[PDB]
Amino acid sequence: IVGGYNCEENSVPYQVSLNSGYHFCGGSLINEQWVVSAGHCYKSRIQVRLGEHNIEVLEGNEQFINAAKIIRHPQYDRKTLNNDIMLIKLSSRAVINARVSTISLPTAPPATGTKCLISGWGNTASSGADYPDELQCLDAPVLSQAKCEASYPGKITSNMFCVGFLEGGKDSCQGDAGGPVVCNGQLQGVVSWGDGCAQKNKPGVYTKVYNYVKWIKNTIAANS
Amino acid sequence: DSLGREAKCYNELNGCTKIYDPVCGTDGNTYPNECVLCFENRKRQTSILIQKSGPC
């Protein structure tokens, strides 16, 4: 996250990380046993970590839970990133407390201008490599679809939107994919891609969770 | 010899996935994923190769 801040305590209890011997993506706890992330985060083995803030120094409330089932969206497109969404079934159920809890799915598609909180342990530098210990947070509003599609001509499908600032300087970055875009208590977006990070006229593009609400419950139900 | 693989891109678009899946350049620099590396080779007109997967 570029241009963000240290998340206050227990400010994002739904945040999780996906791990393959290093921290490589974020995700969101949406059910006692399920995390949602991006399709490009797929790996054949994944360990989920919940309740972190400092990713290098244990604070004591961390839970380490390997993925039992890992389900990339069946129409995931590696070349265009359309349907860049993924479900993960935890092999045991998370213990719910003040630092680990679920977040609701959205009851309506993103609304232009709503303020959202985006979070993750991705890059904090727009040039180079500066990856933080402390979990990062960014308030940034949803941008209009006029603005979004002008920013990425021909490449924004109906399963995508833009969050941030056209003037640049504040964005999600590498290592943040899969992480949450939460607006008024609903998971509206998943960190997916962009042209670099925090550049002029290149805001982050995020998967619109509302379009998969039905698939998520159905796919979860079949594997419960 | 013992050379490096040319980096390549799949995203026929204007941007890159935001995974962290670093790769080690022949310049000694770790790039967070292969896509970001091909963009730098386009942008700065360079030709860094992939020495090996993972960080440098």
Residue numbers in the entry:
A (entry chain A): 24 to 247
B (entry chain D): 24 to 79
Provide excerpts from the study.
(1) The serine protease inhibitor Kazal type 1 (SPINK1) inhibits trypsin activity in zymogen granules of pancreatic acinar cells. TRY1 adopts the typical serine protease fold containing two β-barrels sandwiching the active site cleft of the protease. The inhibitor assumes a typical Kazal domain structure with a reactive loop surrounding a central α-helix. SPINK1 binds on top of the TRY1 p.S200A active site in a substrate-like manner, creating an interface of almost 1000 Å2.
We solved the crystal structures of TRY1 p.S200A bound to SPINK1 WT and p.N34S at 2.9 and 2.1 Å resolution, respectively. The specificity determining P1 residue Lys41 is oriented in a way that interacts with Asp194 in TRY1. The oxygen of the carbonyl carbon is stabilized by the oxyanion hole formed by the backbone nitrogen atoms of Ala200 and Gly198. Unexpectedly, His63 exhibits an uncommon rotamer conformation, pointing outward and away from the catalytic triad. Instead, it points toward the sulfate ion bound within the SPINK1 loop. With this uncommon histidine conformation, TRY1 would not be able to catalyze the cleavage of the P1-P1′ scissile bond, as His63 could not function as a proton acceptor for Ser200, thereby not creating the strongly nucleophilic alkoxide ion. To analyze the impact of SPINK1 binding on the catalytic triad, we employed molecular dynamics simulations by using TRY1 WT and SPINK1 WT complexes, with His63 starting in either gauche+ or trans (Chi1 = 60° or 180°) conformation. SPINK1 binding sterically blocks the His63 rotamer conformation to flip from one state to the other most of the time.
